[PDB]
Design a binder for this molecule. Structure first.
Ligand SMILES: *[C@@H]1O[C@H](CO)[C@@H](O)[C@H](O)[C@H]1NC(C)=O
Ligand SMILES: *[C@@H]1O[C@H](CO)[C@@H](O)[C@H](O)[C@H]1NC(C)=O
Ligand SMILES: *[C@@H]1O[C@H](CO)[C@@H](O)[C@H](O)[C@H]1NC(C)=O
Lengths: 103, 114, 107, 109
């Protein structure tokens, strides 16, 4: 019954709307605004590099809502990890999101 | 918590479970650069109680107490065969491991908008 | 978000197998019995060798990449197996369920 | 709402429909004193598409976008020879709609 007005998946806002069918009275209807932001509370500054301070601000302008906080479940985020095993250093691509993407 | 009270040293433990077979490679990085094996000690792969053939291993890293309170994010990177990318990692800092402060400053603007 | 609640009957001798969808990318596929009192979800069957303590040795996992149905089977029914069994994926269990369905005892 | 996000101007329209005969007059008052004729524009009466012998008009007042932002009434006054006192007026504010009750549901669990 609710039209999916916004289904943002990178800041996770899920704004929507509907018209509430009131009684058979004059049209003093109500329009709904079910905004539903979910706070990660444990992610980093860049979403793709776990070395920055964690997260203080959470800015949500709903006009730029149609850098991110959360991780897209169908997207893959990776990085270069500098391992060595002795003298050589094979900088190899790691996975910051094991299971959203496979090699 | 009680280890960060004597103000002498802090131990971060990287525990790898379920991997089979043995002989997994583990190391630590401090602010994106690796450390010598003179500061972290790994354990031999031991069997698992409820698992038929899966194993587990521990790698402890000991650092100065004041080296962990100011930040200085540590990462544990491991590389076992079975990994789809053959290499994975995890990370902890003072603001992430069992925190005592959820310092939140979320702001929401332009509620009506277009 | 599929909700195919089916009325498959069960008994001690009786065996009921649930059907679930698979992404087939070798992620963590699990069946989980939601607890009404707890308000969370407790994995009864997982990709790994874990099995619930109550369901030890009486459950079987059956995966067909050919037909795109992920199905699990229960050997014996004690008649207490009435709850929301939801399937799913990802490391997470609660917030990752794909389809849910409640099985039933007797009929 | 779409026009106010350009942050340039605000456009208030005084819609005068359902009068008869023609020759209706429109002015734009603000706190008692009128506005200059160069601030608003009035169109000529045109017949109603359904109503046989009636008409309509319009009166566009364009102001700076920031000026709308602080209260400020802009009441439109209409004079036609069929009104009970020959003069009527209407007004809007930034605050002229409804209650718009917020219903916040902050969650920390
Ligand atoms: C940290 O954020 C920057 C800014 O976009 C970006 O390059 C990346 O996500 C992080 N940096 C590195 C070197 O990974
Ligand atoms: C909590 O967040 C505010 C907002 O930026 C910041 O000014 C303050 O320093 C933070 N507190 C601590 C202990 O980091
Ligand atoms: C919003 O208001 C409706 C009725 O006005 C109420 O049923 C609902 O619980 C409210 N939403 C909350 C409290 O999050």
């Amino acid at each position: 019954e609710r039209i999916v007005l916004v289904d943002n998946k990178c800041k996770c806002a899920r704004i929507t709307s509907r018209i509430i069918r009131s009684s058979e009275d004059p049209n003093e209807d109500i329009v709904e605004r079910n905004i539903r932001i979910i706070v990660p509370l444990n992610n980093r500054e860049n979403i793709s590099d776990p070395t920055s301070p964690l997260r203080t601000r959470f800015v949500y302008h709903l006009s730029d809502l149609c850098t991110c906080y959360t991780y897209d479940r169908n997207k893959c985020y990776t990085a270069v990890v500098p391992l060595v095993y002795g003298g050589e250093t094979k900088m190899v691509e790691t996975a910051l999101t094991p299971d959203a993407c496979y090699p | 918590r009680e280890q960060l009270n004597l103000r002498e040293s802090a131990t971060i433990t990287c525990l790898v479970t379920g991997f089979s077979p043995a002989d997994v490679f583990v190391q630590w990085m401090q602010r994106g650069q690796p450390l010598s094996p003179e500061k972290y000690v790994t354990s031999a792969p031991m069997p698992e109680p409820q698992a038929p053939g899966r194993y587990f291993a521990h790698s402890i890293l000991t650092v100065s107490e004041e080296e962990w309170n100011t930040g200085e994010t540590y990462t544990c990177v491991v590389a076992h065969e079975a990994l789809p990318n053959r290499v994975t990692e995890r990370t902890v800092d003072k603001s992430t491991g069992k925190p005592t402060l959820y310092n939140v400053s979320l702001v929401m603007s332009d509620t009506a908008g277009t | 978000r599929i909700l195919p609640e089916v009325k498959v009957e069960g008994e001690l001798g009786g065996s009921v197998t649930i059907k679930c969808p698979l992404p087939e990318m070798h992620v963590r596929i699990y069946l989980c019995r939601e607890m009404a009192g707890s308000g969370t979800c407790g994995t009864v069957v997982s990709t790994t060798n874990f099995i619930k303590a109550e369901y030890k040795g009486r459950v079987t996992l059956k995966q067909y990449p050919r037909k795109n149905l992920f199905l699990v089977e229960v050997t014996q029914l004690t008649e207490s197996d009435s709850g929301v069994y939801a399937c799913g994926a990802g490391m997470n269990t609660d917030r990752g369920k794909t389809q849910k369905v409640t099985l039933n005892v007797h009929s």
